Each structure stands twice: as C-alpha cells, then as structure tokens.
C-alpha cells in the first residue's frame, strides 16, 4: 500500500507524526513517503523538537522528504537538516507526481 | 485635435499638432493624453508607439504661455494642471509596449518631460532640449527629476535644471539624454516591430523593477522568465529557427 | 588661512590656498570646511558656491603626506581624521544651493572627494583626476564610492579606484566625471546666479531624494511642487513675463 | 574541457574554448563556471581574474542553439538551465577580486551576460555586442537587466534588448558598455596586479553596496575604512614610500 | 460520487462541517464518509458544540466515523460519543484504504 | 499535468500562494486551478494583501476560483472581488469534481 | 482660506498630519495653523517619529503650535521640542480664539 | 440647519452613525452631509458591517460622502463602495469648504 | 466668550476635563457648556473616577450636560448620575444648536 | 587593547553585535574576542538572522567564540554553526581565563 | 582561580546557577563566591524553587552571599533565608571589593 | 575606590540608579562614573522619569556620562539631555578604557 503523506503546518507536526505512526502501525507493509513543506520544513532541523520522532520513522523505513523551495524560503541550510533526509525540488510537485504513480494521498 | 493618435498596424503615433504655438501643451491636451494611450494600448496588433510632432519642427515648447499667464493667480487651475501632467507622465512612462520620442526641434520643459517618459529618444540635427522652470521660480515634478537623473546622472541633471539653458542634439547624445542621432524613426521602428511583444513588454517591466529598486531576481521574476518557454512566441521562434526563416511575431 | 571663504553677493568661493603643498588637506582644514559652509549658507543673498584653488594649478593633491606619515601609528588621529573627512563630504554634498568645482590641475584622492561632492565640475585643460588609496593599502569611504558611481557607473569607478591611475580632462569629460570643459566658471556661475533660488534648492533636494532611492512622487513632493505657485519667485517670473523683461530673483 | 581555469600567479584566466560553436555555452559549462570561480578564489596569490576566449575570435555567441532546440519542449531542462545561468552570473559578478572581460569578437546574449558580470570590459576592434532574447520570444533575467542598466542606463538598455541588434566596439565604448578599447588586457592586468588586494576587494564591496542601494556611510563602512590603517598592506605602502621604492603587495 | 472526507483540527470542525454540507448540497447522490481524527475527535462527544450539525449530517445519510487511536489518545470513552457513530482502528488507515477503493479524498 | 489546488485557511494564504508558484515553476506545462473556500475566500478581495500575488498567478495562466458558498458566509459581494476571478457554487464540490475528471489534488 | 486645525490624540497624529497634507494640497493658498494639545503634544518632541513630517509642514509654511498646558502636564521641556515650534498658553483657548477671528475649525 | 459631520476613526463608526441618527432625530429638517476619511472610509465598503445603517441614513436623505485621498490610501476601488455614495477629492477640504458656506461642524 | 465643549470618548475624559480646566483658566469670563455623549456619558455616574473633577467644574460655574440618547444606550438611570447634571434629548443636537446660537465649538 | 566580550541573551544579540561594531570602530587596533553562551549561542546557527553581521565581524578580524556547554544544552550540532566559529569547553571559563590574561571584560 | 559571580535578575537565576555549575566543573580548584542582589535575592528564600541547586553549590564549597540592602528592599527576614547563607551590607560593594582583591568578575 | 558603572537597559534604569546610590552609600569616598548606552540613554532626557534621581547623583558628585553613539541611534539631540551630562564618543569604549585605567567595573 503506497501512501504519499503531506505535512505543511509546523504547529501540527507533532500530531501529524503521530498520525504517520498510526498509519504505519495499522497498514501492514505500508510504503510511506512523508513530504514536508511550507513551515513544516522546520521540523527537519537538527535541533527540532520532533527529531527523535522523525528518526524513529526513519528506523521504521519510512522515507522522510523535505521541500527545497521551502528550505530556501525558511532560510535554512542543508547542513542544518537531520542526516538521512532526502530533498526534492518541490514538495507539492513530489506530492502530485507520487500520486500520478499510484500513491495514495494523505494530508496531515 | 491638437493631440491625436494614429494607429497603423504594428505602429501607433502620438502626434502633437499645434504648429502656431510651437506645439505648446494646454490643460486639455494633458488631460487628453491618457485617453489616447488607453486607445493605443487596447490594440492587440500594436508593437511600438512613436511620439512625435505632426509637422516636424518643434517637438513641444512646453507650457502654453498664454494659459500660464491668464491663470497665474488661479489655485484651482494650478492644482488641476499639476495633477493632469503627473497622470500623463506616469502613464506614458509605463505604457505596456516600447515607446520612442522622435525629436526634430525644441523640446522644452513639459515637452522634455514627455520625451523623458518615452523608452528611447532619437534626435534630428535641429533638436534642442531644456528644462526651464528655474527661470520662472517654479519646480520640476520629482517623477520627472527621476526620469532625467536616470538617463544623465545628477551632475548633468542639475546643470540643465539650475540654468534652464538649452543644449543641442550632439550634446544631448553625448550626455545620454537621447540614445540615437538620426533623421527618421523608421529604422528603429522597423526593428522594434518585428521582435516578440511578449519579450519587450516583460523586459520593459524588469527594467522598471530595477529602476524602482529591485536588486536581485525573486520568485516572481524567476516565474516570468520561465513562462517564456511555455509561450506561443517562443514556439514561433524555435520553429522559425529550425526552418531557417525569420520569425513572425 | 589655508582654507577660506569669500562672499561676493550671489557668489561665494571656497578657496584652497596651500600652493607649496599642492593644496593638500591637513586635519585642521577638513575640520574647518563645515564652518565655512555654515557661514556661506547663512547668507540670504547667496545663489551659488564655487569650490576652487586660490592660485590655479592643482585643485587638491589629497592627503597631507607629511601628516599621514607622522601619524601612521596614531589610532586617535586616524579616527579623528576619518570622522572629519566624512563630515565635510556629507555637508558639502548637501549644501542648500548649487555648488560648482572649478578644477585646473591635479585633483587626487581626498581632493577628488571634494570635487565629487559638488553638484557639477568644470575641468580646464590641465585638470587631472585620480583616486589612489589602493596604492597605500587603504580604502575609500562608502559615501564617496557612491558619489563616484553616481556619475561614472561601476565599471569606470572600479577602473579608477583599483588602479589609482590618473585620467586627463578629456577622459574625465568623456566618462561623466566632469560635466563641462572650459577655462573659467564665470559663464556657468552667471547662469546659476540669475535663476530662482527657490527652484534650485527644491530641485536639488528632489535629485537627492532620487539618489537616496525615491522612485515615485509622494504627498510631500506633490506639496513642494504645488507650493511653488504660492511663492514670491513665481510671482516675479510671471510679472516679468507679462512686462517682457528678465525676472530679477 | 570547453570551459577551464588557468592560474598564473597574480593572474587567473577563465578560458572559453569551443571555437567550432563560436564559444556557445551548454548547460554543463554554465554548471562548471562556479566550480572554476571557487578554485580561483581559493588561491591567496591571485590579484585579478581575466575572462576571455581561449582562441580569440568570438567571446561567446550565447546559448548553444542546438541544445536549446533539442530541449525546446523540456520543462526540466528549462528550469535547470535557468538556475545554472543565474548562479553563474551571481557568483561571477561578486567574485572577491577584480575581474576583466577581454572581448575580441561576438559577445551575444548569455555571452553578453558573462561580460556584464565582470568589473570592466576591454573591446578589440572586431568586438560585437548584442542581447537577443526578443528575437525568440524569451526574456532576460532581471539580475542581468540590472547589470546592463547599471552601465548604459535604461534608454540604451531598452534599445539593445528590444531590437536584439548588434553594436560595434566603438558604439559599446561610447555608451559605456565597455570601459576600454584595446588589443590586449596586458597593460590593465599589470596595473591591477600591483595594487593592494586588501584595497581592491574592500572597494569592490563598497561599490556593490552602493549598487544595492546604500546611500551614506554607516558604522560598518566606517570600520572597514578604519581597519585599513591596521593592515599589512598599509604598512608596506608607507614603508615603501619612505624608502622611495615601489610597494610590493 | 464517492468522497472520503478528512477532519483533523478541532478548531476548524465548524467550518469543516459546513463544507461537508456544501459538498452534499452540490454533488447529487454523493456518497460521503467523514473521518475525524487527532483533536477533531472531540467533536463527536455527546456534549459537543457541533452535535446538532453532526446529527443533521447523519440525517442526510452521511457516514460519520471516529478514529479509535484518537479516541484513546484524547482519553475519551465510547460511552461519551454521539450515538450512531462508527469507529475504525485508524482514521488515517481508513482514509488511505477508502481512497484505494476509489473514494475521492477531501481534506478539511 | 492537471492539478486542482485547495486553499481553505486565510492565515496560510501567503504560504499557499508561494507553494502554487513553486508548483508552477517545478512542473512544466502544469494546468492549475486554485479553489479558495472557507476563510481563504477573503484573499480574493480587491483590497487583499495578496492581490498582487494572485494577479501574478493569473498572468501565469493559472485559474483562480472562489467558492460562492464561502463568499456568502463571509458576507462578501462579487463587486468586492478581484476582476477575472471565476466562481463556483461550491468550492468542495469543484475540488471533488475536478478530481473525478483526473485532476491531481493538492491541499494547501 | 483660514483653517485652524486641532490634533489631540497622540495615537492618531500620523493620520492627522497626512490629513493636513491633504488639506494643503487641496485648498489653494490655504492659511493653516495646527494646534497640538493633550497627548498629541508629544509629537512635537525632537525625537518624535513624525518629526520629518512636521518639518515638511513647516517647509510648506504651515504654522505648528503646541499647547503650554499640555507641555507642562506631559512633563516636557521646551528644550525638547522641535525648533521653530510656536507655543500658546492654551491649545483650546487658541482654537476658540482663532475661530472667533474667522478661522475654519477642523478637528483631527 | 446645515451640519457638516466628520467621521475619521473606523473603530468609532458605529457610534458615530448612531450619533448622526440622534442628530437627525433631534433637529427638525436638518440638512446633513457626512464626510468619511482616513480609516473610516472602510465603512463605505459594500461588505461593511455598518452598511445597513449607512443605507438607512441615505433613506433619511442624508448625504454620505467619502474622501478620494482616503479611498486611495486604503487601496480601495470605487467598485467596492456602497452604491449612491458621493466622493470628494479631499474629505478635509470638503469639511472646511462646507463650513465656509455656513455649515455647522460636528466631529464624530 | 461662549464655548460649547464636546466629549465623546470615555477613555479620554480625564484629559478632556483637564483641557476644560485649561480653557477656563485661560479665557477670562468664559461661558462654558460641556456636553458628554456616546461612552463619555459614563463619566457622569455617581461612582465615576472623575466625579471630583466634574464637581470642581460645577463649582467653577461650568454647565455640565449629559446626552439622554447616550444615557439610554448605556443602560444608565438618571438616579445614577451626579446631582446637578443637566440632560438634553441629544448631545449632538445640543452641540449643533449651541453653535447656531454663536457658541464656539471645541471637540475634546 | 584586548577586550573579551560576553553575549548571553539571545533577544539582545542584535544590539550586542552593533555594540561590538561600535567598540571596533572606536578603539583603534582593538583585539576582540566575542564569547556567546546560554541562549545567545543560537545566533551562531547557519540560519541565524544575525549571520551576515557575525560574518562581517569575522571579516573585521574579530574572534567569534561559541560555548560548547551551551551548544549541547540547546541541542545544536557543530554542523549547524556558522563556518569559522571557534568553540570553547565553557563560555564562562573562557571569559574568566581571558580576563586573567589581561583582557578587558565587556558584558553585552 | 578566584571568581566573584554576580546574579541580579530573579527570572534568570535558574540559568545563572547552571552557569556557576558549569564554571565549577570547568575550572579546577575554582574559588567561587556568588553574590545575589536586587530581585535575585528571592532565590535564597527557604521556599525558593532553586533551593536544592543552591544547596548543591554549597556542598561543592561555593560561597553563597546575599545582599542586605536587597533583603531589606524585598521585605525579607533573615529567618526566611536558606541556612548557611552569608550576608554582606551591599552586594555591589562586595562585588567591587572582591575585584579589587584580585577576584575575576562574572556577571550572570 | 574607582568604579566605572554600566547601565544599558532602559527598563532597568530605576533599579540601576538605586544600586548606584547603594554603592555610594556603602563605599566611602567612592569615585563613580556612570556610563549609559543603548536604550538606557533615554534616562538622560530632560523629561526623563528618573531625572530627579540622576540630578541627586550629580549632587553627590557622581559623574554621569552618556554615549554619543547611543544618543544618535535613539535620534536624540544634546539639547534634549539633562544639563551637566558629559558625553563620550562610545559608551563601551569609555567602559573599557576606564577599566584599563584601574577602574572597577560594575554592570547594572
């Protein structure tokens, strides 16, 4: 079950991440990609309060992706992001493309 | 009419036709100018607007002196006149397509303002330029001070505006007040009329952004740039290039 | 005194009078310059300030080299000197009336700064210009980098400042460093002295607004423009025009 | 490689070496340019970077029309290409040391952008300049519109960009597009290589501050200016002056 | 027209419910399932300020579903929920599965 | 690539619009329709702080659509909206219908 | 046209000053006197955020007047006020007297 | 009894309008002109919360006037204003001129 | 010197009253009438924080007048007002009428 | 003139940095070391709003030092800090030791 | 290494105390005296939230000193202070005198 | 006993001045110089709420010094400052130099 997860609001990241954990726990062999854009990109910073949760998602083999456009608009450096984070040119472009590839969309 | 628009396909002409007053502008002419610009701008076939005298000779000797003197104690006229000139100057300078002033004689004061509001100026050998408010104890609008400084810098701008002295075609060319010397606008208009009107309009806006203080590309200018590759003119350009023929925009 | 002011009605002269050191500026001269500007500015009859050598020849060879070398390890002198020059440059460039530099010889470094701070420059055939801090491992003040770039653009500004090489009168005229070539300031000063001092001062401020980044007219500039029609100079201008006589401002 | 860096002590050369395509830039060349700038910038001995053709003739004919058409319908290429050019232009224009473009032939479009990003340009008699996107329905990046307007003003900028017409070496010199006419960069490079690299780099940053809208000196620019007197280059300058020998920077 | 509606933010429930009413009114014979999770689950409480609106949606034959994971994290008892509410193990799992079944996703 | 974009939160319109600009810049020949509903409809007012951005999207040939139900609930008049704005009976109905027509959904 | 302008609220000084500029621009040869009292007197301080605007009004030959009673109640020193400012014993007394002299009253 | 009424503060428009109603009710055959400028101009928008009150004043034959300078500074379009609203070049200029014509001034 | 003084903002009553004291002290034999309306009417309550100041104005033979329309809209009883306070049907009607009788208007 | 500068409050970093610029500009050949600890350490992050100012201080040959204890307590990674930043085991230990070496202390 | 530590802001005591712990841990055989004055004196109360930390500093042989002038201005009784606390007539006088004795100053 | 006192925070000036009074009272024949910079410079204005305290310090022969850089950044005129106030080019430069001359540093 391929699912492309969207997270855009920084203030809702904690709940969004718990929702992804819920998704993983409920759907056996789920193939999950989480795309963070807009203000939510800040959650991928090394000093992020949700770092341990993000790292746990990575441990669970979940693909964590950050939007480059968002990284730039938030004046963040790739050096500042959690190691092992993949980046795409556009978070919204990735979300749309993954859907065209058959991934089920979930907005958190 | 003393100010009229002629539309001839890709070319429009804003004609000043008041030879017996050396093309001096009255209040009604200033108020009329924006209406003519709107008429020209609504024509999809247009590629370039030429501003010129209908009868050669003087381009525009500036303010109608009889009108100035008759109304010298009329506060309502001064306020109406100030607003009308400022509107005309603002709109001409931001006309969507390339604009060219063809100057064949005296281009003084408010006349110089009109020329300054065009994208480029061509001066014939009899062309003369001056900005003369200091000879009557008046000021020049800041909008037009900026148009002048943009072209010639503050040193020459102050030389011209403090003295009110005229300069000839060659000096205007030397200091950057006019871009070209020549007897006719035909060659330039021919070049302007055949390029992409998507390109000219977009580039014109970029130049204005820079003049208004924009220093770097931002998301919007990157988008405008990118949108060119999705446009019909780019497709005509590349198609024409492959067929080894001139593009038809 | 090595720097003094002469007031002659409509014209004032800021005279540099130190021929045996090629008009080089000492610290006290830099500190003295603002005081002389204040004296000139307080004279209601003044219409134009001319900056020139008292004895022809070199305009200003720049820094007093004996003073520079004697104080090369004196942090207090360097800080005092930096501040004094910056004040002088700031105040000269914003003098209320038109200012003209008459350059008849070498105009180097800090001397070039003085010339750059005037509204316009006239160069006689022996005039030479250069900005030479790069030859001593020093920098030029940003205020004065801007004065230079304003006139000649960044290409020529860097050519001059990176090399410290001198250019002659004709090249300075060609690149926009000086506005006029001539043997004397008399003709220009005559023109400047006879126009409205309301106009020149207001226009000067408008040009400075543009240089400081103002793009469009705003409520304040519209008001200043309008106030001209309520002024005594405008009344003299229109009265003179009706009587077919020259205005007396 | 079609774009390579040669480092020869105080002088580095950015060489364009693709004679069979008139030095046209491909995407990989644009992407390669910043890497070469970084290599040059890391060399403490460097004093000046020269940008030139490896084989004389054309400086840079602009985009590889072949590659452009091959990817006319490829949005990924257009976005990648846009970004690569913008990076190259941004970095070249802000290279820490003086940069000189030696133009000996056609310098068109993206080629003109490269030349515009250098501090100064020298044009040999065969040099030709043009900016031609309007002939394909494309736009010019705002960053590069500004580089052009900085040098030649908005009148000439629009003349060139609206028409896409070429101008010769003498006209480019006349309008301020190039600072110098000559057959070789050797004399200028000799002058640039012998002055203080503390000075050139600091002055270069001041000029850029002015171009980015800085009007007056502030605390930081006063500090930079002052720091010159604490520097090794100033000590070499004054020491050399006392010994009546040329400074060795 | 099958639509799986998501509601996750409690503070936006009033507007979300009006949006569902809008959806129903605009799409003839719409088959709607609304899944509430995260803090939005509180809207399904018997004392909820939007109870009357939820009951009206039920009247309109709209399926109202609450997330069990969310019920648990908000320390709520099934006894506290509006009668006639269906519950799924995971709100996000339901949203993803319904989409795989052809339901159109709408995040409110 | 057909994309139907949703914007519902007024306080997130600035970021949403930048995201649409990102989408446009990243996806070549994207066919974009932006539907604003709930409080976000206020962004389409003539006096809107994002008017210039919306106008730029229009310039880029992006279809800007406002929800009539939302216009009514926010007590706004069509006379108050940016010229050239299209209106649909229901923003959510449009979002669902466009998806059924093959448009890829992106919630901002 | 003689106009006596009143300004009494410090928080509305910026708008009041723009209104005076509007008055000046609209009425040819207007003869304007602006009287500031109560908290608005603070706008005449040398460190005032509206100093440049006040100075521009002075340039336009507008008479700027401060109330002494107000200067005293706000514990301000004449040394602290913008140079060229005239002072009257009572701002309200001046406003009333100017009106009795034929000046048209405008409260801003 | 000719009265020229001024309203300049948007936050006080509701009370100002009630005051005009009071004026009308108390002064028989009052001839009233209300000039709104500065931020108060927003009250003349079609979506204004005081629209019904303004319309009632119009019904009572009260002349409602908006300042053009204010319309411009608030970035409003005439298309956005309540129909039947007259506009003057300057609100303050109108207030002063009406007074010179014998109209009694009332600042609200 | 007849002066009709207006006070309409409750939060500015303290300063307004000091301004009236200033007026009285500056204009010999001033004949003053102070009309309080809108929220300022609350200052005439027996428990008002400015009661002592109002009583002092009364001592100085200043006429203190309260608006009946305002008393009604603020749900106040005449029994609650400071003794010796005169009331008029309309504060604004009084202000306009006094002006027509030759009283100089001062808005505080 | 050796000066050891202390900066400990993140909210005061902008002013502190301007003060260091002031120090540099005023004291010829000043030898300056700036030690940031406690919350101020955040100013040395690559995405810091004062990065350009810090970089300018570095250009002016000013030694910028960050406290390791503070880096650790703020959960920051050295990878996240501005390049060219020196680190000491203890910011306070450095401040005290530099003083014992003859450096003049300045707390900002 | 003799260090005289100053603490003056009550709201910063927790961080200040951790800084002293840092100092102690970093400087071998440090001789530390901590002087609390102004509002920080409240941290030496028996019911203080930082009591356990202060007691630990005492255990580490750190001299904890409270300012008598501050104790008096905060209306505190010596009976209320942590046992084993030394008091000086003036906290600032102590800080200055210790420095004259060669102690290195650290303001926290 | 030579002491150079620093005051930089305007909101803490009252307490700082009391601390200086404490210092003076506690240290016999103290030679005190107080340097105010950053926002604290505002305390030296003629209309300053602490003027009487500053004047009392002057009476006690305490040298009160204001930073010119700070005077400039706060847009204040020397004409606005308390008479008898000395000014230095840089407050921080003065603080450092006095310390090099043997003055004991006290930051308030």
């Amino acid at each position: 079950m391929k699912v492309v997860v969207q997270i855009k609001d920084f203030d809702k990241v904690p709940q969004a991440l718990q929702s992804v954990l819920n998704l993983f726990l409920d759907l056996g062999n789920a193939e999950i990609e989480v795309v963070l854009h807009q203000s939510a990109i800040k959650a991928l910073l090394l000093n992020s309060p949700t770092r341990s949760i993000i790292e746990e998602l990575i441990k669970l083999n979940i693909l964590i992706v950050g939007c480059e456009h968002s990284i730039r608009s938030q004046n963040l450096d790739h050096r500042q992001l959690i190691d092992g984070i993949k980046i795409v040119r556009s978070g919204v472009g990735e979300i749309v493309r993954k859907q065209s590839e058959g991934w089920i969309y979930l907005a958190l | 009419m003393s100010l009229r628009l002629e539309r001839d396909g890709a070319v429009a002409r804003l004609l000043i036709d008041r030879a017996d007053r050396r093309n001096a502008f009255s209040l009604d002419m200033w108020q009329r100018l924006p209406e003519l610009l709107a008429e020209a701008s609504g024509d999809d076939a247009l590629r370039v607007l030429v501003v010129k005298s209908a009868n050669g000779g003087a381009f525009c000797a500036g303010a109608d002196i009889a009108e100035l003197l008759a109304n010298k104690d009329d506060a309502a006229f001064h306020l109406a006149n100030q607003q009308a000139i400022n509107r005309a100057q603002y709109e001409l300078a931001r006309f969507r397509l390339p604009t060219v002033a063809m100057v064949e004689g005296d281009c003084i004061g408010g006349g110089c303002g009109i020329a300054l509001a065009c994208d480029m100026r061509i001066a014939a050998p009899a062309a003369r330029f001056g900005i003369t408010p200091a000879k009557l104890g008046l000021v020049y609008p800041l909008h037009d001070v900026k148009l002048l400084v943009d072209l010639v810098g503050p040193g020459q701008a102050r030389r011209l505006m403090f003295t009110g002295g005229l300069i000839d075609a060659n000096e205007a060319h030397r200091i950057g007040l006019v871009e070209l010397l020549g007897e006719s606008e035909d060659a330039l208009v021919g070049q302007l009329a055949t390029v992409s009107s998507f390109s000219t309009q977009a580039i014109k806006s970029f130049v204005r952004r820079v003049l208004d203080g924009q220093v770097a590309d931002d998301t919007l200018s990157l988008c405008v740039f990118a949108s060119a590759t999705l446009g019909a003119d780019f497709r005509e350009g590349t198609g024409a290039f492959l067929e080894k023929r001139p593009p038809v925009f």
Side-chain angles (χ1 to χ4, degrees), chain A residues 1-3 9 12 15-17 19-20 22-23 25-27 99 103-108:
Chain A
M1 294 184 67
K2 299 174 193 284
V3 182
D9 290 286
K12 301 293 170 62
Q15 293 173 336
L17 296 173
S19 292
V20 172
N22 287 340
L23 184 67
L25 192 58
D26 186 57
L27 301 183
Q99 287 183 63
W103 294 54
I104 302 299
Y105 178 57
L106 177 64
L108 302 174

Side-chain angles (χ1 to χ4, degrees), chain B:
Chain B
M1 298 298 291
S2 60
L3 184 67
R4 72 170 187 272
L5 179 75
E6 295 182 0
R7 293 182 290 177
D8 189 26
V11 182
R13 295 175 291 272
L14 181 61
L15 296 183
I16 308 164
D17 194 352
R18 193 181 188 201
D20 291 335
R21 294 293 180 268
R22 301 180 73 77
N23 284 334
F25 268 61
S26 67
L27 177 60
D28 290 348
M29 290 174 70
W30 286 119
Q31 292 174 337
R32 182 166 174 79
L33 191 154
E35 290 181 351
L36 296 174
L37 288 178
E39 182 178 1
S41 71
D43 184 354
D44 288 348
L46 190 62
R47 299 292 180 269
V48 59
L49 173 67
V50 178
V51 181
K52 66 186 293 188
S53 175
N55 301 285
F59 178 82
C60 177
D64 181 316
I65 295 301
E67 187 187 60
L68 176 63
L69 294 170
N71 293 282
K72 70 179 176 66
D73 298 306
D74 181 331
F77 172 85
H78 289 307
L79 292 173
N81 189 54
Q82 179 184 19
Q83 289 178 356
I85 293 167
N86 286 341
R87 180 176 178 182
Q89 289 294 111
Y90 180 88
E91 291 192 21
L92 182 55
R94 294 164 180 78
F95 189 74
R96 67 184 182 82
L97 290 168
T99 305
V100 179
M102 182 66 216
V103 180
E104 300 179 32
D106 290 352
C107 186
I108 299 170
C112 189
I114 292 167
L116 288 170
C118 299
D119 290 308
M120 46 204 63
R121 290 142 291 281
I122 300 168
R128 297 194 301 179
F129 302 85
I131 303 171
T132 60
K135 292 184 175 181
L136 294 172
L138 296 173
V139 180
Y140 206 53
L142 191 62
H143 182 269
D144 299 330
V145 170
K146 183 175 194 309
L147 290 174
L148 180 64
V149 170
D150 285 348
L151 299 174
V152 305
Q156 292 292 339
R158 290 177 300 224
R159 177 194 169 202
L160 292 171
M161 290 190 292
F162 293 171
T163 64
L166 303 183
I167 62 170
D168 67 18
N170 288 340
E171 179 62 7
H173 191 241
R174 192 192 71 78
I175 68 170
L177 185 60
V178 303
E179 289 70 28
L180 289 168
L181 294 176
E183 295 179 358
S184 174
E185 69 273 21
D186 285 341
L188 176 62
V189 165
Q191 291 176 327
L192 292 173
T194 61
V195 299
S196 166
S197 68
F198 174 88
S199 292
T200 57
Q201 294 179 94
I203 292 167
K204 184 171 181 169
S205 294
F206 276 8
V207 171
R208 184 61 70 193
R209 288 198 72 191
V210 170
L211 293 174
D212 290 351
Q214 188 63 30
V215 175
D217 279 288
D218 59 14
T219 299
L220 288 171
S221 72
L222 292 171
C223 291
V224 168
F225 182 91
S227 75
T229 59
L230 301 177
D233 287 353
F234 178 70
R235 290 191 290 277
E236 170 58 11
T238 56
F241 200 99
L242 291 173
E243 292 182 358
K244 299 182 182 178
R245 65 175 173 85
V248 180
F249 295 109

Side-chain angles (χ1 to χ4, degrees), chain A residues 54-72:
Chain A
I54 292 162
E55 286 182 347
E56 286 296 310
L57 294 175
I58 291 169
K59 287 179 191 177
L60 296 174
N61 300 308
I62 295 168
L63 184 60
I64 307 300
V65 178
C67 172
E68 176 60 12
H69 289 160
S70 298
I71 290 166
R72 291 178 185 192

